[PDB]
Every structure is written in C-alpha cells, then in structure tokens.
Amino acid sequence: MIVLFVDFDYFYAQVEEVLNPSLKGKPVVVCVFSGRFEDSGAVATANYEARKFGVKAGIPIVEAKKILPNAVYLPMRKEVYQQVSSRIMNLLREYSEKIEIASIDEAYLDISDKVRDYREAYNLGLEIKNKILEKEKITVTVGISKNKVFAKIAADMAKPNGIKVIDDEEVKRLIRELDIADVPGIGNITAEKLKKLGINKLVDTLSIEFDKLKGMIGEAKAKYLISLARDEYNEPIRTRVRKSIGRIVTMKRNSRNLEEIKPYLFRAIEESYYKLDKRIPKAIHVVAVTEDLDIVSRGRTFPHGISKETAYSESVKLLQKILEEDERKIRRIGVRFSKFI
DNA sequence: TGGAATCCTTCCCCC
DNA sequence: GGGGGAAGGATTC
Ligand SMILES: Nc1ncnc2c1ncn2[C@H]1C[C@H](O)[C@@H](COP(=O)(O)OP(=O)(O)OP(=O)(O)O)O1
Ligand SMILES: [Ca+2]
Ligand SMILES: [Ca+2]
The missing domain is CATH 1.10.150.20 (5' to 3' exonuclease, C-terminal subdomain)
Structure with missing residues (x-):
C-alpha cells in the first residue's frame, strides 16, 4: 500500500496572499477578532514570514501585534478558504478515487493502483504540487509512505513547499x-x-x-x-461523513443573565440552520465556554427531526439547565446539531 | 477563536 | 453479565 498526503501551506494566509498578491513577502496574520475590546481574539494562522518570529495559530492578536506591530492583519474569511479548498480537493480526485478529506487543508489519497513504487509516487507528488500551483497558485507539502500516519509525518518533516518519502x-x-x-x-x-x-x-x-x-x-x-x-x-482511506454541524460565538461581556445570552444563542442557531442546508438533525446540544475557559454542554436527542422553531425553544431550556447547574459566568455560547436523518 | 471527529466514563433500561 | 443507547466530557487537529 502507498499513501500520498497533501497539506496546503499556511493555508488561510496563503489564500489571502493569492487573492491580494501585494501581500507576498510581508508577514500576514489571519485573525479571529472576538469583539470584546480592540484586538481581542486569537490568530487563526500566519504565513512563514510571521511565524519565524513566533506569531502563530493560538496566540492572542494583542500578542502578535506586540511582536510584529507592522505585519498585515486580516480578519478570517472561512467561506472563501472553504470554496478554494473544494476546488483543490477536486484536482486531487483526478489522481485517485479513494480520497480522505481530513480537514479544510488536508487530504490522503490511496495511489496504490495508480503507481508502482516510491520513484513513481515522488513524480505523481510533483505532478500534483505543480498542477495545484498551476491551477490555483497554491503551494502544498506532500508526504508519501506505507500508511496514513507516516504519510502525514513525512509532510510535517518536509514543510513548507516540500515533498518527502518515508x-x-x-x-x-x-x-x-x-x-x-x-x-x-x-x-x-x-x-x-x-x-x-x-x-x-x-x-x-x-x-x-x-x-x-x-x-x-x-x-x-x-x-x-x-x-x-x-x-x-494499516487503516484505509475512507470518505469522511459530516456527522455534526454547529457554531459557537463569543459574547461581548461574560454574563449569567438569560436575556443577555439569548441573542448570541439565537444567532448561533440561525447560522447553524443555514449551514445545515436541507439536512435534518434529531439532536441539539448547547455548548458554553465558562469564564475560566472550561466547557459545559447540555443536550437532547429527539425521536424526530428538529424544526428551527423547536430548536429555539429547546436551546433555551438547555441554556437554563447550564445556568442552574454551573455557577460560573458564560464567556462563549452556542449549539451543535447532529444525528441527521 | 473556533469547528468537528473520536473517544471515554457513566448512567440507565432491560433481557 | 452484557447489549445498546444517551449524555457530558476529554483530547486532538
Ligand atoms: N489553532 C487554529 N485556530 C484557528 N484556525 C486554525 C488553527 N490551526 C489551523 N487553523 C486553520 C488555518 C490553517 O491554515 C488551516 C490548516 O492548519 P495547518 O495544516 O495546521 O497549518 P497551516 O495550513 O496554517 O500551514 P502549515 O501546515 O504549513 O503549518 O486550518
Ligand atoms: Ca497545511
Ligand atoms: Ca504533537
């Protein structure tokens, strides 16, 4: 068995780079602003010119700004990177039918049939990196080995813009x-x-x-x-199925008042139902991030699907359970839907 | 920040 | 004892 794994380099920042080529060469920081104070939030990711100074996924935007006050700071546009992602995933399907889409920027391919050894795989490697660079102007790293795990390890070793065989x-x-x-x-x-x-x-x-x-x-x-x-x-490459959809939002101020939390919760439900797109869930979970950044959830499974109207009313019950059972303030609130018909 | 899979512990209902 | 499903978390990327 031969597995080929593709990871798209500094993906969100690179899409931003591609869509606005003047960015190239500059440090670019893709941010998730949370709206509590100026620059509250975290870094979703950064390109290499920013990463080499420690600016990376996870750190607060105020911290990134302290280290690189003149970098370019962009709000995250997930939908755009997602549409670009799909296009690239399509390119890879033309190289194998067996394809495991692991994340927005990760895919494994079973190229056992299409190739005879690690010489040919390396070539198909380059064919792919080049095709994706050509068609999309996006650099990726490629890892090739006998199973998924090692394919991925190869990629980690070889990034960015690498290709590696273990x-x-x-x-x-x-x-x-x-x-x-x-x-x-x-x-x-x-x-x-x-x-x-x-x-x-x-x-x-x-x-x-x-x-x-x-x-x-x-x-x-x-x-x-x-x-x-x-x-x-020796696990196999398989189509991964959407099993859950949801959305969690950050409130301007931590709170325990029910009427203060509801509109964020309602917005969360709204965005979630749009994302469902003809999908019908029989499960709702209300998820809350407490003020000490701990995560509490209360949920319920129905014997039928959940209408938007039902989700509104049930989510408030579950939100109320949470308040009744946890004494801390709520920092972030939201929902997941699951168990689709 | 933040989406979502997969797993783990526990509880419960019931042959 | 154990199948079988829920619920609430833990852990990861
Ligand atoms: N901690 C995070 N918070 C928010 N978004 C993230 C986080 N980590 C990764 N992402 C998003 C943006 C990334 O571009 C994309 C893929 O992540 P990842 O493969 O680990 O690194 P990367 O795409 O930024 O480049 P690279 O693999 O070369 O480090 O998912
Ligand atoms: Ca990547
Ligand atoms: Ca690790």
Whole structure:
C-alpha cells in the first residue's frame, strides 16, 4: 500500500496572499477578532514570514501585534478558504478515487493502483504540487509512505513547499528514532502521560503491559500506538461523513443573565440552520465556554427531526439547565446539531 | 477563536 | 453479565 498526503501551506494566509498578491513577502496574520475590546481574539494562522518570529495559530492578536506591530492583519474569511479548498480537493480526485478529506487543508489519497513504487509516487507528488500551483497558485507539502500516519509525518518533516518519502527502512528507523509527541493523535496531554510511563519513542510502547497502557491513555489510543510500533498500522482511506454541524460565538461581556445570552444563542442557531442546508438533525446540544475557559454542554436527542422553531425553544431550556447547574459566568455560547436523518 | 471527529466514563433500561 | 443507547466530557487537529 502507498499513501500520498497533501497539506496546503499556511493555508488561510496563503489564500489571502493569492487573492491580494501585494501581500507576498510581508508577514500576514489571519485573525479571529472576538469583539470584546480592540484586538481581542486569537490568530487563526500566519504565513512563514510571521511565524519565524513566533506569531502563530493560538496566540492572542494583542500578542502578535506586540511582536510584529507592522505585519498585515486580516480578519478570517472561512467561506472563501472553504470554496478554494473544494476546488483543490477536486484536482486531487483526478489522481485517485479513494480520497480522505481530513480537514479544510488536508487530504490522503490511496495511489496504490495508480503507481508502482516510491520513484513513481515522488513524480505523481510533483505532478500534483505543480498542477495545484498551476491551477490555483497554491503551494502544498506532500508526504508519501506505507500508511496514513507516516504519510502525514513525512509532510510535517518536509514543510513548507516540500515533498518527502518515508520508505520502509525509515519507517523502522522512525519507530525507534521519532519522538512519540511528534506522532499524529498525540497532544500535550497524552505526551505527558506517556513520559510518566517512560514511553518517549514509539518503540517503548512494546516495553509495557498492554493493560497499563489502556489504563492510562485509553484502549483505542493504546492499540493505535502498538500497531504503529509494530509496523502493522494499516487503516484505509475512507470518505469522511459530516456527522455534526454547529457554531459557537463569543459574547461581548461574560454574563449569567438569560436575556443577555439569548441573542448570541439565537444567532448561533440561525447560522447553524443555514449551514445545515436541507439536512435534518434529531439532536441539539448547547455548548458554553465558562469564564475560566472550561466547557459545559447540555443536550437532547429527539425521536424526530428538529424544526428551527423547536430548536429555539429547546436551546433555551438547555441554556437554563447550564445556568442552574454551573455557577460560573458564560464567556462563549452556542449549539451543535447532529444525528441527521 | 473556533469547528468537528473520536473517544471515554457513566448512567440507565432491560433481557 | 452484557447489549445498546444517551449524555457530558476529554483530547486532538
Ligand atoms: N489553532 C487554529 N485556530 C484557528 N484556525 C486554525 C488553527 N490551526 C489551523 N487553523 C486553520 C488555518 C490553517 O491554515 C488551516 C490548516 O492548519 P495547518 O495544516 O495546521 O497549518 P497551516 O495550513 O496554517 O500551514 P502549515 O501546515 O504549513 O503549518 O486550518
Ligand atoms: Ca497545511
Ligand atoms: Ca504533537
């Protein structure tokens, strides 16, 4: 099996660059302004000229501004990047039918049939990078290996504007060599839990009683890691299905007054129902980010779909449960819909 | 900030 | 005991 993975370089900033080419060469910061004070919000992403000074996804816009007061700061336009995304995904379909769209900027391809080895794959690699650059003026990084996980690791190593092959000899090398934190699916919380068990490299996973692993990081993530370390990971490329739709918004001020929270909640419902587009959910969840940035949710599944009218009334009940059961103020409020007919 | 998948624990109903 | 589904969270990208 041969998997080819594509990650679109600094994606939101690059689209902004493409749509306004004068940006190129400058540091560009795509921001999610939250509207509480001037420059409240976070950075969605930044191009490389900004990242090399620490300006990156996650940091507050006020912090980015302190480091690069003269960078170019743009509000995020998700819809635009999304439409550009779709176009690029279409290009890749013309290279394989088996395609796993992982994110707005990530896709895996099963090119087992279309190619014979890591020479030919490298070429198809370049064919694709070039086609996407030609048709869309967008640079991407390509990772190629024996399974998804490694395909992605290859890309991470080779970015930006790279293309990289992790063969079999390297796979075996990285199983011993690679820091387990750099393995997809392993965040700060799992990486620290693995340190406490002495797992610092993928191979260490074999020096443990399976139940102690399951006991710590959970069963599924334990099997994941073990199969990887055993050169045995082999999950297939599959169409991912939209299972949930929603939208959460930031309120100007933290609050506990019901009538103060409702309009944000209603706006959240509205945007969500538009996004549904002929989809009909039987589940609603009201989600709230408390003032200490903790996340509380109350929900309900119906035996039928939910009309906009029903969602309005039910969301207020769930919002009321939340207030009744959590004493903190609400920072962010919103909804998810799920269990589509 | 923020969308959404996947997972995990718990509770519950009931053969 | 365990299938089976909900609910509320935890974790990740
Ligand atoms: N923490 C975040 N907050 C908001 N949006 C994000 C965040 N991280 C990523 N995104 C968005 C914007 C990104 O361009 C896009 C893809 O993320 P990602 O693949 O990790 O990096 P990137 O596209 O910005 O470039 P690169 O992979 O070269 O670092 O999704
Ligand atoms: Ca990318
Ligand atoms: Ca990591």
